[PDB]
Structure formats: structure tokens, C-alpha cells
Design a protein around this ligand. Structure first.
Ligand code: HEM
Ligand code: HEM
Ligand code: HEM
Ligand code: HEM
Length: 107
């Protein structure tokens, strides 16, 4: 069975890189992020060719990498989508978890 990697993973496909820590996401099943593709949970890097490899941040199709990390109403939760739900009405948590700058994702 796949094992989570070490904390401090840098997502760095863009000029706004973001650190991801598995240890803070244990309340989330692995396959909610490493989601099924052709019926099997896929543990490849999200931006693998044929996956979320479109680096046009304006693309709203499934292959758009920005879209996959930021948008609501997606088939699997995005980073920002799930964080918005988590923050609820708490403005401090909305800033920490969903702010576009000065958040835990982007400085
Ligand atoms: C569940 C305990 C779980 C496992 C297992 C797991 C594994 C895993 C691997 C093996 C990697 C490395 C991939 C590589 O080859 O680079 C990896 C990377 C990322 N993960 Fe993960 N992961 C588990 C859980 C979760 C959860 C719950 C989320 C989403 C909240 C998540 C996300 C990520 C992300 C993002 C990465 C980086 C991918 C990248 O493209 O570099 N994982 N995980
Ligand atoms: C990496 C951990 C990773 C993330 C994060 C992720 C997210 C993601 C979202 C949010 C969606 C929904 C988009 C929408 O509804 O518009 C989505 C959908 C698909 N993904 Fe993905 N995804 C990650 C990893 C991977 C990998 C490694 C591949 C390629 C093997 C891949 C592919 C796809 C496909 C295909 C879809 C659409 C699925 C369907 O319609 O059932 N993703 N992903
Ligand atoms: C998507 C790849 C993604 C990123 C990036 C991400 C980041 C992130 C950070 C930076 C934190 C703060 C703690 C830390 O420094 O590790 C954090 C915390 C929470 N997250 Fe997250 N997160 C990503 C995705 C997801 C997904 C898809 C969910 C829900 C399904 C989720 C949830 C949470 C929760 C819960 C926390 C803790 C919140 C807190 O108040 O402490 N994240 N994540
Ligand atoms: C707030 C809604 C918000 C904005 C706006 C935003 C912007 C942003 C940009 C411009 C990029 C780079 C896109 C490109 O291709 O040039 C980027 C990248 C990532 N972001 Fe973001 N972002 C906002 C908020 C958040 C939050 C709160 C998280 C974490 C939950 C987050 C995550 C990510 C991830 C992951 C990336 C990709 C990192 C990489 O691979 O380089 N964003 N964002």
C-alpha cells in the first residue's frame, strides 16, 4: 500500500509554489486527493502529462492545474474548495486557509 511522504513537499510547477504537508491532512482519505482514474487511485504527481498539465491558469477544464487547485464545484475537492468548507464563517480561518496572499498557501 502507498505510504504518505515526508512533510514539506514543494508544489513548484508555477512561480507561486506552495508547500504541502501530509501530516496535517490525515482526516482526508488518500483517494480524495489521489483520486481514481480509470477506476484506480492514482498516486502520480498531479501535473503529470495527461493529468493536470495545462499551465494556463485561465483554463477551467479538468486538465487545468490552477483550476484543480483552486476551484469550487469540481468532481474531487480542490485545495481551496475544501479549505473554504473547513473555514466556514470564520474570517481568521478564511484568511489562513483560503487567502490569496498572506495565507498558509501563499505568502
Ligand atoms: C494517504 C495516507 C495518502 C497517501 C498514501 C499519499 C501518498 C502520496 C505519495 C506517494 C506522494 C508522492 C507522489 C510522487 O511520486 O511525487 C504524494 C504526494 C502528494 N499528495 Fe499524498 N498521500 C496521501 C494523502 C493525501 C491527501 C489526503 C491529499 C490531499 C489533501 C494529498 C495530496 C498530495 C499532494 C498535493 C502531493 C504532491 C503531488 C505533486 O504533484 O507533487 N495526499 N502523496
Ligand atoms: C494530485 C494530488 C491531484 C490533484 C490535487 C487532483 C485534483 C483533481 C480535481 C480537483 C479534479 C476535478 C476537476 C473538475 O471537476 O473539473 C480532478 C479530475 C481529474 N483528474 Fe486529478 N488530481 C490529481 C492527480 C491526478 C493524476 C495523477 C491524473 C492523471 C493520471 C489525474 C487525472 C484526472 C482526470 C482524468 C480527472 C477527471 C476525472 C473524472 O471525470 O472522473 N489527476 N483532479
Ligand atoms: C491541495 C494540494 C492542498 C493544499 C496546497 C493544502 C494546504 C494546506 C495548508 C498549507 C494547511 C495549513 C497547515 C499546513 O501548513 O500543513 C492545510 C490545512 C488543512 N487542510 Fe489543506 N491543502 C490542500 C488540500 C486540502 C483538501 C482537499 C482538504 C479537504 C478535503 C484539506 C483540508 C485541510 C484541513 C482540514 C486542514 C487543517 C485546517 C486547520 O485549521 O488547521 N486540504 N492545508
Ligand atoms: C486566492 C483565491 C488565491 C489566488 C488568486 C491564487 C493564485 C495563484 C496563482 C496566480 C498561482 C500560480 C498560477 C500560475 O500558473 O502561474 C497559484 C498557484 C497555486 N496555488 Fe493559489 N491562489 C489563491 C489561494 C490559494 C490557496 C489558499 C492555496 C492552498 C489551499 C493555493 C494553492 C495553490 C497551489 C497548490 C498552487 C500551485 C503551486 C505550484 O505548483 O507552483 N492557492 N495560485
Amino acid at each position: 500500500a502507498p505510504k504518505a511522504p515526508a512533510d514539506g513537499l514543494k508544489m513548484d510547477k508555477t512561480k507561486q509554489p506552495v508547500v504541502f504537508n501530509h501530516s496535517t491532512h490525515k482526516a482526508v482519505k488518500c483517494g480524495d486527493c489521489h483520486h481514481p482514474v480509470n477506476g484506480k487511485e492514482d498516486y502520480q504527481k498531479c501535473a503529470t502529462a495527461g493529468c493536470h498539465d495545462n499551465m494556463d491558469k485561465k483554463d477551467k477544464s479538468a486538465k487545468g492545474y490552477y483550476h484543480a487547485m483552486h476551484d469550487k464545484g469540481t468532481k474531487f475537492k480542490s485545495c481551496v474548495g475544501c479549505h473554504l468548507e473547513t473555514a466556514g464563517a470564520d474570517a481568521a480561518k478564511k484568511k489562513e486557509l483560503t487567502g490569496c496572499k498572506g495565507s498558509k498557501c501563499h505568502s
